[PDB]
Design a protein around this ligand. Structure first.
Ligand SMILES: COc1ccc(OCCCCCCn2ccnc2)c(Cl)c1
Ligand SMILES: COc1ccc(OCCCCCCn2ccnc2)c(Cl)c1
Lengths: 236, 255, 273, 40, 273, 59, 59, 57, 40, 40
């Protein structure tokens, strides 16, 4: 008989442990694995695939239309859309990125925001996208917007433009749930010159917008998502 | 002078040419291949009809109009009646296959509109009734007709609400599945190569569909002034590397 | 590892930021393709986002309850909670479901942990000390009919004996007929016109039968069982869109009617911040 | 040290440290180079 | 090591005891610079004054309380202590604060130890045996609303199950967004005219939710939770003047008005002994 | 199963111990350290800095 | 005295375990084995012997 | 270990499927003696049918 | 590691991995070859 | 022997045995020698 002493914590059950436990049904024998395409190893692998952002959130019931950012022909100087960058809330929240970020407490890294244009091929347009780093207000006019991170996008044969929100930060991690100290800025978009439709054409054209994370990205300290809850256990 | 843009796919006794492609997607970066022995379980030698089943079948055409919500086809169902592919299907106990899907929609440089073409492995549909109402067989086996998401709820059928992918997930995130867009201004076809994806090496072709192909208008169709307000969309699909096993009497399936 | 390299002004014919999303790719664009950057290192590995880590902590998967009381004159033990089942799940308690359903196919060893606590809601002189028995009476296995049937001999059938207030742990390999468990299944068990749909067809693995071994004391004692499940040795294939609407049933994808808009409406314009 | 005979009884697995998003982010048939035109 | 060397009479032009304190230095003068000394050795290392040792013993950081009782008809569990929070601190119980605030910046791993004891202030037949559950429902995490919410599934959220009367231990790395925790912060969360001041802005790390897993017995049981915290792997930067006045608030430096003189007045003259 | 005997003191909590405890949140990943001037290692380092004495205590 | 911590599952009895237990009657001494024809090692050995099927179940 | 070997058409004078059960033997006939098979491996050892396992709980 | 002195006290035995059905499936005195006629 | 995988779970650290008061006691820009005049 070897002398032992038990410490504080004996008998506790910590749902975040990784120890051994006996095998209820020994000498069993699993079924062999066959090959299946698509294996995922890290959630970091999947948040780099871009998905659509319901940017046009202004509706009243969920609709395919809140994915469409409208553009008006012949407007000059004006603003196309605006949003803050609380990736865990608001427009971002239902996107795959938003949806995964919510399983973690802290995030750090660059984001990739792209816009794909869908107007007739014989039209043309020049837009400016601007990222405003924390510390200033959402820009109120392009002059204000153009003094921060921006890209003049020229609509052409190449249909999409990929803007990166480079990680601009004092503190090396931000909270995924919106927090002030930790806030990330604003994203706005304005006409640089203006949309022009060809003859025989009319109305609004739309941009689709996507979001995905750069390879830069870090997420840490897992927790429970506000995105799902329940009141009684389900049954069959 | 090769462009990403022009392409030719020849499979069996049938060929497709596109002069306005946008590359092609190969699901999960894997190309269809036959079933290796190391992965095999059933001891039966399989049948590989080759060129008589691995050719291109063009399903009947759809009509995109400003009110369209989107269409959904299931595989191998959509092909249950195409030539010898279909016969083999009803006659063997088990079968396995990959596909090349080519979705076509051309317009002019004055039109606008953008379709999402996506392949969803194991797309289990939801009942519009809620609770634990099931979706009857016939409803998930529309055949070449596919399911028309702008048709009305029916009884025992699935829900046809587009912002929810027919299953409780948001349209916006379908982009995590192999997919390609058809943006009239860019593109006129979409091509996806689908490798066989299952948790068993070979399965039944009639009790289980392993992918749904979905074509969904996202930026509404907008035709030039005084143009007819609609465009046809055509889907052509070719089984590839097909194998059938466990031949016998010929399945009888509901309806 | 560098998180960003140093990059300076650019005036090229080579534009990495113009792409064609119609192709289905997400081109790997970085901050340094469009602004001037400085070197910085990652200092991080992505350890805690590994799927083994993501699915590897215990989650509550089931709460049931049984009571110790005089069975004298009870015509239906099962009905008096003199013993009680649990049709093995992992999709009843939605918190771990969303997690799991982020994947199509998934394979993982298992480690079950059962906590049992007792309650004595009405006047008792004391708290008795009860031993729970937990058993696996699967497909072919004689189901218990009374709380003290021959079934409970369980001599070929695994079964646990632990004390109420304590905890019963153990683990289990992948006992799923196929190479992976299907998180989703767009099929039927056969080509029947009325057979059921979903995965409720596959997820076949009998139920768990709990009972108190003790005979009855003078008062009644409520014992409530909580089953926790931790995946170990995880393997997951084919990512899918996360669950947006609420769940209604074990094993079907169905969402409730007149549900509410899941996308938050702006308080303001598209232009609003 | 494993104290038990069966593999299911061992603790959690250890980090894939695999990580390759290209099956998801770039499943295109003809390779796309960043910087070269998307559609030629 | 010598504590003092031998030194004899001196009659020099080299005076080590005259200095200019205006410079900000404390010149390293020793007994042997001004008296005649003999050799002596230190016999000591200064082991127990290492900062790891100074901050490394468990200190009580929080006492809370929850009760097990029939929740039937309770409209606000939180309010009935049917469960209860603790906005993670370490500056509520002043004994460890002064210690900690002797430093500006400070980094240390953690080891939490939770003791739970039960009380039955009014007539009970017995002492029941309750299991406590302790959880981390941080920033983004659904906060428990009832004592038996879906939240308590905590399948992604760490949570402890131990018995009242026992103790729950575990440890935690440095989960502080920056390189160190700020013991002080002369800033705001943004340039707002009315936003709060202190470190109450930074110290963001959600709260701890405790609850009893047991349903209710016939009597009521008070369970009082004491959280102890021990720093391990300590790193501290920039020493500061010790706290002289009493504390009034978590996270602000504020002292009470009409406080009392903190320097003891002489009973006698400056000249007094 | 290896035979053991527990000694007096089992289960006690001594606030002056230094033993191991599981990590509540594994595979976490701390934030890197940056350099900060002023690190203190021993209280013996700081009590050698001189400070003023309120010698005139008579108020 | 070596410090220990007990885990969840301590004291449980799992009828499907394979651990050691003391020998009630030590220094005993079994009876030698003699040879007996017919040893079975696997149930897989015996299910390969064919047996009759009551196919005509209609009685 | 192979569970089934590959075997093709047969037109022989050597018939493994005709036997005389009166002898008391169970002749070791396999799928590949009477249909055309493909190779497959066992992937299994028969561990949990060992008599030690069967009587050991 | 055995902690106990007697052999009865050790854990379960380990798989025969013996397996030879012929004493049960082919106890015939003159050897029968599959494919050759049963009765000559 | 660490029984646990993570570094936070290890016991207390071990004595700096670093000790250098000069950052606090003599942060002067031009070095002062004891015995030499403070102000020259
Ligand atoms: C109490 O002893 C037991 C002895 C053996 C057992 O095995 C249980 C196997 C069930 C695995 C379920 C995993 N799963 C189910 C559906 N999806 C995932 C169980 Cl659960 C308990
Ligand atoms: C019960 O399980 C838990 C699982 C994880 C946890 O982590 C707690 C991290 C908080 C560290 C606080 C240190 N601190 C706070 C302010 N100054 C210093 C906690 Cl506290 C408990």
């Amino acid at each position: 008989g070897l002398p032992t002493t038990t410490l504080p914590g004996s008998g506790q059950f910590l749902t975040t442990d990784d120890r051994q436990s006996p095998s209820a049904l020994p000498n069993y024998e699993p079924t062999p694995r066959i090959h299946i395409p698509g294996k995922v190893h890290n959630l970091l692998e999947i948040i780099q695939v871009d998905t659509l952002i319901p940017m046009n959130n202004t509706h009243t019931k969920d609709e395919v239309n809140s994915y469409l950012i409208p553009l008006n022909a012949n407007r000059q100087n004006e603003q196309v859309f605006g949003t803050n960058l609380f990736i865990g809330d608001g427009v971002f929240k239902t996107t795959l990125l938003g949806e995964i970020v919510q399983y973690y407490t802290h995030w750090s890294g660059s984001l990739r925001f792209s816009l794909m244009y869908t107007g007739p091929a014989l039209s043309s347009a020049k837009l400016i996208l601007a990222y405003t780093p924390p510390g200033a207000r959402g820009p109120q006019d392009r002059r204000e917007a153009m003094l921060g991170t921006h890209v003049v996008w020229d609509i052409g044969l190449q249909s999409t433009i990929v803007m990166t929100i480079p990680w601009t930060s004092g503190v090396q991690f931000r909270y995924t749930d919106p927090d002030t100290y930790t806030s990330a800025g604003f994203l706005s978009c304005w006409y640089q010159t203006s949309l022009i439709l060809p003859p025989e054409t009319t109305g609004q054209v739309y941009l689709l917008s996507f979001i995905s994370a750069c390879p830069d990205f870090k997420l840490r300290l897992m927790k429970d998502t506000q995105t799902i809850s329940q009141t009684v256990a389900l049954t069959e | 002078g090769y462009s990403d843009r022009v392409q030719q796919i020849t499979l069996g006794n049938s060929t497709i040419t596109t002069q306005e492609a946008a590359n092609a997607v190969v699901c999960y970066a894997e190309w269809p291949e036959y079933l290796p022995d190391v992965d095999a379980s059933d001891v039966n030698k399989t049948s590989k009809p080759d060129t008589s089943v691995c050719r291109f079948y063009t399903l009947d055409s759809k009509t995109w109009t400003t009110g369209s919500k989107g269409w959904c086809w299931k595989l191998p169902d959509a092909l249950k009646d195409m030539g010898v592919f279909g016969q083999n299907m009803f006659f063997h106990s088990l079968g396995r296959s990959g596909y090349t899907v080519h979705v076509q929609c051309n317009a002019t440089k004055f039109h606008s509109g953008c379709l999402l073409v996506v392949v969803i492995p194991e797309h289990q549909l939801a009942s519009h009734e809620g609770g634990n109402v099931s979706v009857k067989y016939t409803f998930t086996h529309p055949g070449e007709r596919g399911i028309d998401l702008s048709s009305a709820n029916e009884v025992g059928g699935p829900v046809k609400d587009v912002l929810y992918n027919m299953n409780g997930t948001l349209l916006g995130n379908l982009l995590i599945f192999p997919h390609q867009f058809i943006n009239l201004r860019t593109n006129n076809t979409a091509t996806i190569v689908i490798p066989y994806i299952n948790s068993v090496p070979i399965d039944s072709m009639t009790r289980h569909n392993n992918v749904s192909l979905m074509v969904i208008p996202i930026a509404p169709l907008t035709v030039p002034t005084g143009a007819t307000p609609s465009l046809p969309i055509t889907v052509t699909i070719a089984p590839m590397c097909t194998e059938f096993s466990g031949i016998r009497s010929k399945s009888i399936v509901p309806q | 590892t560098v998180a960003s390299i140093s990059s300076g002004p650019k005036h090229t014919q080579k534009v990495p930021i113009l792409t064609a999303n119609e192709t289905g790719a997400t081109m790997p664009v970085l901050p340094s393709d469009s602004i001037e950057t400085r070197t910085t290192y990652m200092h991080f590995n992505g350890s805690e986002t590994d799927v083994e880590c993501f699915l590897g902590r215990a989650a509550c998967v089931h709460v049931t309850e049984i009571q110790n009381k005089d069975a004298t004159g009870i015509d239906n033990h099962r009905e008096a909670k003199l013993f009680n089942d649990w049709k093995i799940n992992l999709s009843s308690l939605v918190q771990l479901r969303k997690k799991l359903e982020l994947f199509t196919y998934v394979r993982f060893d298992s480690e079950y942990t059962i906590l049992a606590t007792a309650s004595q809601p009405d006047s008792a002189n004391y708290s008795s000390n009860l031993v729970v028995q937990a058993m696996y009476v699967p497909p072919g296995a004689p189901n218990p009919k009374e709380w003290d049937d021959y079934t409970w001999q369980s001599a070929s059938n695994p079964s646990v004996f632990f004390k109420v207030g304590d905890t019963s742990r153990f683990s289990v390999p992948y006992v799923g007929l196929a190479s992976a468990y299907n998180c989703f299944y767009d099929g039927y068990s056969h080509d029947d016109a009325e057979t059921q749909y979903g995965i409720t067809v596959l997820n076949h693995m009998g139920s768990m039968a709990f009972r108190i071994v003790n005979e009855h004391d003078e008062h009644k004692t409520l014992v409530k069982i909580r089953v926790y499940h931790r995946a170990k040795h995880v393997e997951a294939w084919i990512p899918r869109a996360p669950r947006a609407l609420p769940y209604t049933s074990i094993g079907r994808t169905n969402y409730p009617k007149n549900t509410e808009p899941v996308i938050k409406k702006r308080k303001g314009d598209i232009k609003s911040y | 040290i494993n104290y038990y005979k069966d593999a299911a009884s061992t603790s959690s697995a250890g980090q894939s440290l695999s990580m390759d998003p290209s099956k998801f982010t770039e499943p295109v048939k003809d390779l796309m180079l960043k910087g070269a035109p998307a559609l030629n």
